[PDB]
Amino acid sequence: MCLKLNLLDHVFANPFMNAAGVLCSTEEDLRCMTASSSGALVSKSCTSAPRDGNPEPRYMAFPLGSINSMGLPNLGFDFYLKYASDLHDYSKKPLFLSISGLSVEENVAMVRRLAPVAQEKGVLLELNLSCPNVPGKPQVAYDFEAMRTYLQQVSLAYGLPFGVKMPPYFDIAHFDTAAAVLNEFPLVKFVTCVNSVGNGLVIDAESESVVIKPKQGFGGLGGKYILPTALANVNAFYRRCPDKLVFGCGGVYSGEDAFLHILAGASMVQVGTALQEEGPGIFTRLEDELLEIMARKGYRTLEEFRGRVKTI
Amino acid sequence: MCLKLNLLDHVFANPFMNAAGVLCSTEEDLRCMTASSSGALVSKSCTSAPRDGNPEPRYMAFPLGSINSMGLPNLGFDFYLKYASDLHDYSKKPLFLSISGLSVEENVAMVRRLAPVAQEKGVLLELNLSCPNVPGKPQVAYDFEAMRTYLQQVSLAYGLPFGVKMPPYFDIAHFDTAAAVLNEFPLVKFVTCVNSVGNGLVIDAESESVVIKPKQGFGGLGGKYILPTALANVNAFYRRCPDKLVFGCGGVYSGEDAFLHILAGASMVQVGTALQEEGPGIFTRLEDELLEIMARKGYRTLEEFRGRVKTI
Ligand SMILES: Cc1cc2nc3c(=O)[nH]c(=O)nc-3n(C[C@H](O)[C@H](O)[C@H](O)COP(=O)(O)O)c2cc1C
Ligand SMILES: Cc1cc2nc3c(=O)[nH]c(=O)nc-3n(C[C@H](O)[C@H](O)[C@H](O)COP(=O)(O)O)c2cc1C
Ligand SMILES: O=C1NC(=O)NC(C(=O)O)N1
Ligand SMILES: O=C1NC(=O)NC(C(=O)O)N1
Numbered sequence: 001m002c003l004k005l006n007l008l009d010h011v012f013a014n015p016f017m018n019a020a021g022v023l024c025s026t027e028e029d030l031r032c033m034t035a036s037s038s039g040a041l042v043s044k045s046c047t048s049a050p051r052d053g054n055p056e057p058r059y060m061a062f063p064l065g066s067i068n069s070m071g072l073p074n075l076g077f078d079f080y081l082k083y084a085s086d087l088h089d090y091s092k093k094p095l096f097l098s099i100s101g102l103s104v105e106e107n108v109a110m111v112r113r114l115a116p117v118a119q120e121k122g123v124l125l126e127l128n129l130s131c132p133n134v135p136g137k138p139q140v141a142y143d144f145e146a147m148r149t150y151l152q153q154v155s156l157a158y159g160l161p162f163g164v165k166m167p168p169y170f171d172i173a174h175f176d177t178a179a180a181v182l183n184e185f186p187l188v189k190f191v192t193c194v195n196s197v198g199n200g201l202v203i204d205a206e207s208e209s210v211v212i213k214p215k216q217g218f219g220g221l222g223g224k225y226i227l228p229t230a231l232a233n234v235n236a237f238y239r240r241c242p243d244k245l246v247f248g249c250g251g252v253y254s255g256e257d258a259f260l261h262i263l264a265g266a267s268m269v270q271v272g273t274a275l276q277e278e279g280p281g282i283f284t285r286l287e288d289e290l291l292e293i294m295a296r297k298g299y300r301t302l303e304e305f306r307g308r309v310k311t312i
Numbered sequence: 313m314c315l316k317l318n319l320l321d322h323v324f325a326n327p328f329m330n331a332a333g334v335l336c337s338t339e340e341d342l343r344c345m346t347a348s349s350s351g352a353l354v355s356k357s358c359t360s361a362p363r364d365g366n367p368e369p370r371y372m373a374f375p376l377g378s379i380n381s382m383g384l385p386n387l388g389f390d391f392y393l394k395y396a397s398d399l400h401d402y403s404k405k406p407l408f409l410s411i412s413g414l415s416v417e418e419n420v421a422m423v424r425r426l427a428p429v430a431q432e433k434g435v436l437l438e439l440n441l442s443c444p445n446v447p448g449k450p451q452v453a454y455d456f457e458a459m460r461t462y463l464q465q466v467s468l469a470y471g472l473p474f475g476v477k478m479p480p481y482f483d484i485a486h487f488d489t490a491a492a493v494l495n496e497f498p499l500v501k502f503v504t505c506v507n508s509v510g511n512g513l514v515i516d517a518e519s520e521s522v523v524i525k526p527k528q529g530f531g532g533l534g535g536k537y538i539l540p541t542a543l544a545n546v547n548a549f550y551r552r553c554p555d556k557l558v559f560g561c562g563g564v565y566s567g568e569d570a571f572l573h574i575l576a577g578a579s580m581v582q583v584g585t586a587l588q589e590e591g592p593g594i595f596t597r598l599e600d601e602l603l604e605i606m607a608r609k610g611y612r613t614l615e616e617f618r619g620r621v622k623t624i
Contacts, residue, residue: 057624064376064536138485170480170510172530173450198482201544203572205605209622216623218484218544224376225537232513232530260515293517310521311528312369 001291001300005039007245007267008124008161008189010094012039014290015262015302016283019222019249019272020045020098020126020165023280025074030083034092036280037287040268041093043080045100045128045165048109050076054133054214059276060202065223065251066273067202069133069214072100077110084114084123095121098165100128102137104146104153111158118160126190127154130167132198132220139167139198141178148181155187163190163247166237168197168229175233179240192247192270193233196220223273227251231264238265238307255289265307313607315351315599317614319557319579320436320473320501322406326351326599327574327614331534331561331584332410332438332477333357335592337386342395348592349599352405352580355392357412357440357477360421362388366445366526371588372514377535377563378585379514381445381526384412389422396426396435407433410477412440414449416458416465423470430472438502439466442479444510444532451479451510453490460493467499475502475559478549480509480541487545491552502557504582505545508532535585539563543576550577550619567601577619 003014017040023029025044033041053073060067074080080097088095097114101107107127117123129141129150141147141164154162164182169175182188200221202211210217230250238246248266252258253274261269275282299305315326329352335341337356345353365385372379386392392409400407409426413419419439429435441453441462453459453476466474476494481487494500512533514523522529542562550558560578564570565586573581587594611617 067540132482138483142483142486168482170444170482170512171450171454172511172527174454175511197541199484199487199544199548200482200540201547201576202540203543203575203621205568205571207622208575208617208620210624213624215484217621218548221540225540228379228512228514228533228537229509231515232511235513236511236530256517259517263515263520264513305520308520309515309529310519312522312525 001294003287003290003302005267005302010122012094012268014039014287015258015267015269016286017041017268017270018275019270020128021070022272022276027083027087032280034089037283039093040096042096042098042126043083044074045072045098045131046074046077046080047072047101048077048106050074056213058212058214060211061273061277062202065221065225066276067200067212067219067221068196069212069219071133071214072131081113081117084121085117090121094124096124096126098126098128100131102134104150107150108153108157111154115158115160125158125162126165126192127162128165130165130195132167132196133214135215141167144177144181148184151181151185151188155185158187161187161189163192164188165192165195166233168194168226168233175236175240179237182241182244188244190245190247191237191241192249193237194230194250196222197226197229222250224251224253227257231260234261234266235264235309255286255293258286258290259293262302262306263309267306313603313612315603315614322434324351324406327579327581328595328598329353329580329582330587331582332440333382334584334588339395339399344592346401346404349595350405352408354408354410354438355395356386357384357410357443358386358389358392359384359413360389360418362386368525370524370526372523373585373589374514377533377537378588379512379524379531379533380508381524381531383445383526384443393425393429396433397429402433406436408436408438410438410440412443414446416462419462420465420469423466427470427472437470437474438477438504439474440477442477442507444479444508445526447527453479456489456493460496463493463497463500467497470499473499473501475504476500477504477507478545480506480545487548487552491549494553494556500556502559503549503553504559504561505549506542506562508534509538509541534562536563536565539569543572546573546578547576547621567598567605570598570602571605574614574618575621579618
């Protein structure tokens, strides 16, 4: 029995990694993720310049999940590029670098500089087209023309394999259109489904107040709230993009949740809210729990059940 | 202290009603809802002709909520119109009739015949622009040009006040556009937020199978999963449509959940999944629980706190 994967010309001890934004902003965070039992890690979505992000409080967790409006607080592209070039220990595990420019031009600027480092070191780009938290900036991939423009411009400027962090969709027509756009771009090798469920609103009954400060309380949802949405998106893109990989993200707290993502079609499985809440010890637990389910079912490898969800 | 309120030139004993589709398909169902302690009821979304709906199993409930792909099973508009015209006891509580044509023409056909009954009896139209479960029929109000066309044509053909059942949105730009479309139509007096969260996917780990048959397992989500999404939509439309009423729907299991909806801006509060699971006894519990919270806080009226959610 084993959790090993070999994909994108890299080897992974297991399918687990942090979700972008969680435990991955500082050098300390990245070293911590590297020291963990995760199979990989991804850095905080970055912008050209450092950002303070949105006003606090901007993250709150509850029994059923989280709400956040972080606002892309990050140390700036220069830092994450330097981490990938000079600091990351690739002998430990593969590194993904997430970018989330506020315009196509900003993304293009970053990828032009990332390309030689990706070539040399094998760092893998995750392009974030789904941030729901910057005021005045709607989710890029909810506008299919904008999505196409970003992918065209990034493909041309980068010229190397990359992946895309996608927002959740709720409409069959949108799964159809979004996947068709992705399929226009042969350099898009993986699709990460999903980013947080945008612009939810948590209200505290006692205080009669929203629980986060930015955007009048409106923030992205993660955790237990979003698992069926995440599974739907993973499966929708797994079915529609048979020549790409799908990475699952959303609502993973247990080996069983990971098992469901993998049944739906996930290769890598990312952990956001649950990792934020439990800390990096979660990775040993997820591995043990997934292996236990596999043992009970007689599955020896991930490929034996990946994408094998049954319909009625 | 009592929960009595007046809206749309009708008097309501309390703000609670069923969500369309739950306990409202047959004459038996409607008599049951009328006999309950709810402040109002709404009939099953109907089509011009009777429908069997999608193949079973098509509804499944879990601790965190429900998934459904009913497919508009209904007895046909003729029946619901007859119920409104001949059978409903308006002395008990107000009646809403929901319609969900599969085209603008079909909705127009229904509203032309509803009009005289609305004039005579005061039945209230809820136009469903958000069914996420009929194969090959995407949610109307995710297509803003289609939404405008439906509202223009229904407004012209009906000529009387009505309301609209809206899908959940997840994007500030979409709240902005959707509310602006609604504000073009003075006959739209209420906005019901939200219909089920479309095209989620629940998978059973033991059987490795989806849990509903239609559409390869993809169905609308209700219940605990969707409360922050529902609150966000209620509040977004409450803020953007200051001259209309907003009805809250989504994730109501308790008087506290109802309190949150009302804080967010809800006038009426609809109950779907929790009512499907618990039965019509839920309405006495919801009323008792809401009154208790109000008493603890020193609120004497719903008006004292409706829409008064605090921001930071
Ligand atoms: C604290 C916070 C910060 C996040 N930052 C990013 C980000 O930088 N880039 C990104 O693509 N997603 C970001 N996300 C979204 C997560 O990567 C993930 O898609 C989402 O939280 C759903 O997964 P979950 O249910 O495991 O939380 C963030 C989420 C949270 C909780
Ligand atoms: C069994 C089932 C059938 C439904 N049928 C309709 C329908 O006919 N028309 C409609 O507007 N909404 C329908 N809905 C959606 C509900 O009215 C409601 O918007 C949704 O379930 C969210 O509320 P909840 O969290 O209380 O379940 C249905 C929901 C379920 C559970
Ligand atoms: O892509 C993102 N997803 C989130 O949930 N939060 C952020 C962020 O605001 O940093 N970005
Ligand atoms: O508008 C609807 N919402 C739902 O959740 N289900 C249905 C239905 O399929 O009958 N219709």
